[PDB]
Amino acid sequence: MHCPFCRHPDSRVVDSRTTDDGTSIRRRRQCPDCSRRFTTVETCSLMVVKRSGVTEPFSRTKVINGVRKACQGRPVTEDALAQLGQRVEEAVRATGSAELTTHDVGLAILGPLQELDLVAYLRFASVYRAFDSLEDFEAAIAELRET
Amino acid sequence: MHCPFCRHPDSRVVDSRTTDDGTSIRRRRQCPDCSRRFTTVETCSLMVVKRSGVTEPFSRTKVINGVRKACQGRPVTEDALAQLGQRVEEAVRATGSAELTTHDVGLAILGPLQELDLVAYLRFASVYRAFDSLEDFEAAIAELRET
Amino acid sequence: MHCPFCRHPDSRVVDSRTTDDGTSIRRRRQCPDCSRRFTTVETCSLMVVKRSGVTEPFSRTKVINGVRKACQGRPVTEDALAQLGQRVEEAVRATGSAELTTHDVGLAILGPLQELDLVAYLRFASVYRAFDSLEDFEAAIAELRET
Amino acid sequence: MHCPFCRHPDSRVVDSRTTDDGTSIRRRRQCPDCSRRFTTVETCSLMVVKRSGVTEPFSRTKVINGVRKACQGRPVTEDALAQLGQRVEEAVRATGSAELTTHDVGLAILGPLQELDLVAYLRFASVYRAFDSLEDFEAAIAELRET
Amino acid sequence: MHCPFCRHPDSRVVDSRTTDDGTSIRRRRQCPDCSRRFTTVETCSLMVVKRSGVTEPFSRTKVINGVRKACQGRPVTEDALAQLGQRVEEAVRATGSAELTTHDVGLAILGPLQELDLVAYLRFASVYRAFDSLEDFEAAIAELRET
Amino acid sequence: MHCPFCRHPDSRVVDSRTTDDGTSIRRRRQCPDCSRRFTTVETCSLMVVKRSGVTEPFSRTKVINGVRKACQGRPVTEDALAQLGQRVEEAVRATGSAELTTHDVGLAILGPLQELDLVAYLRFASVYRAFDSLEDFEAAIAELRET
Amino acid sequence: MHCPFCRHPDSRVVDSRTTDDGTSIRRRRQCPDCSRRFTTVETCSLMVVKRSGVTEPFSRTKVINGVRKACQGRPVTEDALAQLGQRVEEAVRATGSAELTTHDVGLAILGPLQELDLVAYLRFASVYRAFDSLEDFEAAIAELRET
Amino acid sequence: MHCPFCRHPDSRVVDSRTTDDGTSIRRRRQCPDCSRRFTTVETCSLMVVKRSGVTEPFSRTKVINGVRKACQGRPVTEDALAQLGQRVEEAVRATGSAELTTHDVGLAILGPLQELDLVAYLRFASVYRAFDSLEDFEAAIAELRET
Amino acid sequence: MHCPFCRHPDSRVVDSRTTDDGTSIRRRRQCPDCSRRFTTVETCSLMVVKRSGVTEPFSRTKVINGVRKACQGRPVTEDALAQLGQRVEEAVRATGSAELTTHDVGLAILGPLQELDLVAYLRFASVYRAFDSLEDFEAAIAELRET
Amino acid sequence: MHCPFCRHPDSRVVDSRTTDDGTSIRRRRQCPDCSRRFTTVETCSLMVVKRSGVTEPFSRTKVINGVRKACQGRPVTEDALAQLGQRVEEAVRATGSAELTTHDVGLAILGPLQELDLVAYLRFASVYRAFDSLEDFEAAIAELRET
Amino acid sequence: MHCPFCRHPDSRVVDSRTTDDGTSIRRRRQCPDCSRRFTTVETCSLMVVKRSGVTEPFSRTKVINGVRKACQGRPVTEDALAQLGQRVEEAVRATGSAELTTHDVGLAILGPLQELDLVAYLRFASVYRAFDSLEDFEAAIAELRET
Amino acid sequence: MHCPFCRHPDSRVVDSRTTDDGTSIRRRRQCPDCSRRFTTVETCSLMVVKRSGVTEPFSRTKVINGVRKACQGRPVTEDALAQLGQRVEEAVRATGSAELTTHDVGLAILGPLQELDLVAYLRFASVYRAFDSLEDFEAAIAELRET
Numbered sequence A, B, C, D, E, F, G, H, I, J, K, L: 001m002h003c004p005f006c007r008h009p010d011s012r013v014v015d016s017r018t019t020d021d022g023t024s025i026r027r028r029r030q031c032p033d034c035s036r037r038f039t040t041v042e043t044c045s046l047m048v049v050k051r052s053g054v055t056e057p058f059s060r061t062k063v064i065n066g067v068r069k070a071c072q073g074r075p076v077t078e079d080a081l082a083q084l085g086q087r088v089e090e091a092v093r094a095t096g097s098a099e100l101t102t103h104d105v106g107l108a109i110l111g112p113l114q115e116l117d118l119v120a121y122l123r124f125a126s127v128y129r130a131f132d133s134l135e136d137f138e139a140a141i142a143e144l145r146e147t
């Protein structure tokens, strides 16, 4: 990493410790040229921006609850819901963005949910793909037969 | 009744009053321990059996909130939702079923909801008409085109 | 209470039980004339309507937290904050309304908060009394000297 | 680093990459237990000491949210709030204090906030200028009339 | 359904069978985790609302046990208790009340119990006829002498 | 205490310790004449003999539950029930017997229960005083008017 | 299942939910002909009838404790006892009866216990097979040599 | 001694009395906190070391209950069991062992139990004579035929 | 307090917060002349120096345990021991020293212990007052008679 | 025996060996679960009954530690303490008491301790000779002067 | 095992029970010749002697903490540290000694620690192998290259 | 500040006093609940950021203890350690770093420690100079030979 003071191309790591909660790693680095020591923090935090304008930490439990409610009346097991939540969280974190919108969360859910149950996928994409008339629903039923 | 402040198991009744309509009784109570007064209302409210064994008081607010969450992203005004809720409550009161469940409450909304919107109606009716297959959605789409 | 079926002026109570959680009392009444038995529930539930349009149960902890944050930098004890929360909850419940707006909650807070601390009261009423210019603040400082 | 999915204490580093700017490092990590990959970013971020001993990364979002909550009920646009946050961040970066606390961050907002509004400025400056008395509010009101 | 052995949340259905009478369905299920099979029976059983909001399946065994505990120390044979339970169940089935409570079940026992015994009847009827005063007991003693 | 070995009229206590659970006190005594050390245990254990022939430790919770069920439909508070249980336990222990029958427990309950509620006392003594006909109940109602 | 009202040969399931505790599944069915909706409950409850005449829920812990006491002084591990309890519970539930006698529980235990330990099996069957004289014990020792 | 009512750690001694026999001391105690009195008895009771390190007071009731549970299903009267318990207690008192264990107590029952019954004796002696093999049972059956 | 930078005679407090654990108070002060802000911490920590050379936080539980062991065989209650520990802690903290030796702790204990029990005080001062011969013990017994 | 590593309830015995002296048996055991071996030693050790009901193996180390803590601040060498411990163990082994308590172990130390020191002896003998009064200490001081 | 009374070459085991905490097994044995019953205890206790002269039970957590601190700044995982602690405990227990010195504990740690990390092994053996000058460190670095 | 005795959240300030030096303030406080007084000291102490985010007051005692534990087994006197600690504290005070971490404190010890000893210096400098390889130890050994 570039030294904050002299902008040297590289620096050496002289201390590293994982935080007690395990979320972040605190490192202390020293610049080889100017011999100056600076502190850096490495995190894996993820945030979702609510439609009301408030950002809150990502939660797999809320995704599982939402997909469970959307799968009401269908034969879905708890192991399948947990696996779907894990897949959604992994796919969301793979983008690398620190914060994302809940619409993108729903779009990510749309993938595994189709493999889970077709009725729940249809009644979920009717909201998150913005269906406007019966024709849009009929086209979606046709895409599912093609896939 | 348990005190709302200090959770004392028993509370006296300072006074009681029957409303002019006669379907409600309003009581003022005082906790023997903390000597802090509060108020209670007793009504012969219509109960609905949930999907579990728990019975819950009927509330038009929950019906309106559910249909609005089903109507999100659609051009549905609040006046139409209020009229739909009033019609559903009137229907469930007029039927006078021996054992009223929340499934029957969800069934009473399909009628009024069909006139308001078709996308929201299809979403809502996909649950309480127990949709098992995509072909069942197509049959409802054909019925909506006929109506 | 009036009998739901025959609208008799009064009815007799033949059963009563406090709920396990203690929030409500379930009574069973019998009409003296038509000999018909009906069930009533007595509750003390209280709800606050958020500015976002969602109603949630009243909480004294949130009131205490808000007044504590508004009293930042001032000599306020935890016993005083707990007593203020108790007073606010008692005054709110005394109105008898099942649901109220958070603006009314702030107006109720405005009473005891003035007795608690003047600076916090000023910086709280500047929001909940809708002060517009410096003149409104100066008039409030004058009312506090008069009181 | 603890795995975000299964909370395994240690995680390998699949790969690392230094950004073009050079002030950040982006790493892809994999959990040895569940074999689920995620991403982390390490930056030499400016830390602020809170009112407790806990140090928190600097975020313009928190400053903007706080000033907006102070500016509620006032004709303040979002562009003005963004400009105020940018000015505050630039000021705190330019001062280069040896030990930067959140109190100094709250002090850097009074300047820009005085131009935007007077009610919101008086609310915000009543805290970080440590207002003890009503007369202190009057002196600030006189200063605002002069400026 | 949760497995009775290892409490796994979901269980498959190995097979199902409809009984000759047609009012019951007997299923054999297997837990996916432990692969241990068990059996379940589904019936459209008559539910009674307890003194709380909890609904419980009707059981003549509970009625017989309660009346026997009320008949302790009295010359009442088991055949008479069985006949009383059968009569009470037949009465509650024949009335076909819209909302059947345990209070009505306790009321259906007073009739048959009056013939069997007078001490046990007076004990049992002191509850469900809501006896408030000693004079109410005397009026029931006079009624028993008349009958 | 008499020495177990030589039957000396008195002995001296040389060690004493209360048990960790606090139920018993273990003492070590030495005989002044023969200089012999022996161990004694002091207990306050109390047992009730069930009608099935099994002896179990005395419990105030069971007494409270029984009197609560016998007071069904009557205005009895939890503090009153706890005080009645305490009085029953104290009166039972005052006799000094290590074991007693549940009939004696009911006879002890009969005292405070009359002061608590007359209806519950009547329906409890009808079982624990062995009433045989309506005449026995009428005589009991007369004794209550006299007292 | 047959419709309770019109006795139609079959009915359709329109709602299903597993209970929170997971013991039962509540279904709502609708008759295709008369369009009437009725509620059914599916359970896996099991009861054992004590020799005193009281029925209590089946417990694997009590079976394990009994076989452990019967295996006193013998080399039996806790894993073996847990497996024996699981086998006993599975064999008991395989019969399909909702309630069974403890004698049948002992007869079920007699199977795996013989494979576990011969001495414990002998001293357990001497009670649950009703041995009368030494000849019955000698014959049992001979059956074990044959098997 | 801990109070039986409120569990206060220490209790005073209101009075003490030595019995006429001299082997017991009866004390009346009062709790300083709740001021509720109770009674205690101190005796130099004979202790038996259980299979663990815990020592328990000797009780003929436990011996009689154990032998009766061993004698279930056999024509053994209660008088014979009482005589057996008296003989066992007399034997264990007369031996005067330095360290008396419950194993020795179980050994003192085989003698008297041999005369009462043979099936119950064989069951009981299969434990405390440490039966390892079926041949050991056969040798005891041969000994019983000789005696 | 003097300003750390310019040594001004006095400074103003502009921020104060009690720590979450409540042990310390963190204040932020500003010098009136040089307008410089500095952080101070107020603590009430107390340490005892073990004879092995290690300093550990003061504990009332250890003092109570020590005095309890020194009072073995004497009539001392738990309330008295707790009060003695409280008195010892208060007297130790009254000196104002952050760290003290365990010998001073014993000297502080010597005060209340004499009022508690004379035998324990003698056997405790024989260690913490360094008695050398029987004459020193005799003189101490004489001082106790004088006091 | 529970495994020391993973706490598995049962452990096999890899091998056993009887020592040359014959008073000990050394076994090597292996846990079935983790397959980690350990060693155990079984001896017919002399047990002492503590002040509670718990029996503890006799250990000269505890006696030496206790007397040393009593001898602190006194010119007592470690060789003298070892000789005292050896003498006490020899005495308690030679007496062969039927029921050996820790009080008798504390009594066996007074003899040897009288020769070693007088201050430490007086401290130690103030406990196990049950000193009630200062005059009892004076009588022991007179006895020490005579001896 | 040899009989404690008559020194017979072998004895038979007639009772065995594992302790509730699982640390020890209590056996009761009987001598075939003199027919005398004696109690033995089998334990797996392990103790470490601190350099201050106090013996305390062996703890794997302390070993893990020590090696973790010695591995500061090195890539060591928690699973590796737990495995090293398990190996150290197993190797220590394999010697069969009931008590050992902490120097031997460090010597045991020296084995796996070399396989874990070379820098930590060097900085740990510099203390537990008593390095005196730079030459001793250089020789150790040479042994590591050879191994 | 929380009371050290009863943990009451808030404590009054009985009195305050500024020390002659002026860098400390000594206050006497009293708890409102228990009315037990204690003392507190407030100083503008130099804080060091630990390897985590927690800041800790600087203490020469910790530095001396750490270096002594590093110097164990070496001929280093306590006076030399005190001089080293004084030099390290003077150096860290004289540098006046903007953000002082414990890593910099560990770096300030290498200088003075090089003169005192070479083995202890090599141990201590193997951590804070971040030794990755054995060759890095050899380079430091060569540097020590040069110096």
Ligand SMILES: Nc1ncnc2c1ncn2[C@@H]1O[C@H](COP(=O)(O)OP(=O)(O)OP(=O)(O)O)[C@@H](O)[C@H]1O
Pocket: A048, A050, A051, A052, A056, A057, A058, A059, A060, A062, A063, A066, A067, A102, A103, A105, A106, A109
């Ligand atoms: N904290 C959270 N972490 C992760 N995903 C979340 C979180 N909160 C909500 N979600 C996801 O976002 C979806 C919500 O989408 P939507 O934008 O309609 O809701 P919202 O605006 O958050 O809800 P609300 O109506 O309560 O304001 C949920 O179905 C869920 O999958």
Ligand SMILES: Nc1ncnc2c1ncn2[C@@H]1O[C@H](COP(=O)(O)OP(=O)(O)OP(=O)(O)O)[C@@H](O)[C@H]1O
Pocket: B048, B050, B051, B052, B056, B057, B058, B059, B060, B062, B063, B064, B066, B067, B102, B103, B105, B106, B109
């Ligand atoms: N207490 C109530 N009063 C009136 N209408 C209700 C009540 N509870 C639910 N409803 C409405 O009746 C329908 C019942 O929906 P649904 O079967 O999903 O409810 P539920 O029992 O709450 O389900 P779940 O408990 O699984 O979330 C919806 O339209 C809902 O808005």
Ligand SMILES: Nc1ncnc2c1ncn2[C@@H]1O[C@H](COP(=O)(O)OP(=O)(O)OP(=O)(O)O)[C@@H](O)[C@H]1O
Pocket: C048, C050, C051, C052, C056, C057, C058, C059, C060, C062, C063, C066, C067, C102, C103, C105, C106, C109
């Ligand atoms: N659940 C609650 N129960 C009781 N009082 C509440 C509750 N939530 C908020 N309040 C009160 O209402 C006040 C909030 O007023 P305001 O209308 O500005 O907030 P809001 O709209 O609820 O907040 P938000 O900005 O998070 O949507 C709080 O200071 C508190 O006293």
Ligand SMILES: Nc1ncnc2c1ncn2[C@@H]1O[C@H](COP(=O)(O)OP(=O)(O)OP(=O)(O)O)[C@@H](O)[C@H]1O
Pocket: F048, F050, F051, F052, F056, F057, F058, F059, F060, F062, F063, F066, F067, F102, F103, F105, F106, F109
């Ligand atoms: N463990 C107990 N401790 C104290 N009192 C008890 C206990 N168990 C029961 N009781 C008292 O004894 C009364 C029971 O009297 P009764 O002889 O009719 O019952 P029982 O024979 O114990 O009951 P069951 O019918 O269950 O065998 C209860 O009302 C209660 O007051």
Ligand SMILES: Nc1ncnc2c1ncn2[C@@H]1O[C@H](COP(=O)(O)OP(=O)(O)OP(=O)(O)O)[C@@H](O)[C@H]1O
Pocket: G048, G050, G051, G052, G056, G057, G058, G059, G060, G062, G063, G066, G067, G102, G103, G105, G106, G109
């Ligand atoms: N709640 C229970 N669930 C399952 N099995 C049980 C339960 N209670 C007892 N059992 C089984 O039944 C056996 C008891 O048989 P038995 O008929 O002799 O006892 P009981 O009549 O229940 O006992 P008691 O003498 O206490 O009245 C036990 O060994 C155990 O295996």
Ligand SMILES: Nc1ncnc2c1ncn2[C@@H]1O[C@H](COP(=O)(O)OP(=O)(O)OP(=O)(O)O)[C@@H](O)[C@H]1O
Pocket: I048, I050, I051, I052, I056, I057, I058, I059, I060, I062, I063, I066, I067, I102, I103, I105, I106, I109
């Ligand atoms: N952490 C502590 N906090 C407060 N008081 C303590 C603490 N530890 C010990 N004490 C007090 O100090 C006394 C100990 O005095 P002493 O100097 O003989 O012990 P020590 O050197 O600490 O013990 P050890 O022999 O275990 O090293 C105890 O009786 C107790 O009152």
Ligand SMILES: Nc1ncnc2c1ncn2[C@@H]1O[C@H](COP(=O)(O)OP(=O)(O)OP(=O)(O)O)[C@@H](O)[C@H]1O
Pocket: J048, J050, J051, J052, J056, J057, J058, J059, J060, J062, J063, J064, J066, J067, J102, J103, J105, J106, J109
């Ligand atoms: N297991 C043991 N083996 C040998 N000697 C012991 C043992 N336990 C205690 N002792 C010694 O015997 C005497 C008993 O002292 P004391 O009565 O105070 O012990 P205690 O039962 O441990 O007391 P407490 O449990 O109340 O601390 C002391 O001299 C003690 O060192």
Ligand SMILES: Nc1ncnc2c1ncn2[C@@H]1O[C@H](COP(=O)(O)OP(=O)(O)OP(=O)(O)O)[C@@H](O)[C@H]1O
Pocket: K048, K050, K051, K052, K056, K057, K058, K059, K060, K062, K063, K066, K067, K102, K103, K105, K106, K109
């Ligand atoms: N209770 C324990 N159980 C097992 N191992 C231990 C225990 N306590 C310490 N150890 C081991 O012994 C090592 C300590 O060696 P050392 O002799 O230097 O310490 P010590 O004398 O016990 O410590 P102290 O300086 O605190 O008195 C630790 O690194 C650890 O591996």
Ligand SMILES: [Zn+2]
Pocket: A003, A004, A005, A006, A007, A008, A031, A032, A033, A034, A035, A036
């Ligand atoms: Zn640089």
Ligand SMILES: [Zn+2]
Pocket: B003, B004, B005, B006, B007, B008, B031, B032, B033, B034, B035, B036
């Ligand atoms: Zn209250």
Ligand SMILES: [Zn+2]
Pocket: C003, C004, C005, C006, C007, C008, C031, C032, C033, C034, C035, C036
């Ligand atoms: Zn009516």
Ligand SMILES: [Zn+2]
Pocket: D003, D004, D005, D006, D007, D008, D031, D032, D033, D034, D035, D036
């Ligand atoms: Zn993982």
Ligand SMILES: [Zn+2]
Pocket: E003, E004, E005, E006, E007, E008, E031, E032, E033, E034, E035, E036
């Ligand atoms: Zn299962």
Ligand SMILES: [Zn+2]
Pocket: F003, F004, F005, F006, F007, F008, F031, F032, F033, F034, F035, F036
């Ligand atoms: Zn004697």
Ligand SMILES: [Zn+2]
Pocket: G003, G004, G005, G006, G007, G008, G031, G032, G033, G034, G035, G036
């Ligand atoms: Zn039908």
Ligand SMILES: [Zn+2]
Pocket: H003, H004, H005, H006, H007, H008, H031, H032, H033, H034, H035, H036
């Ligand atoms: Zn008490």
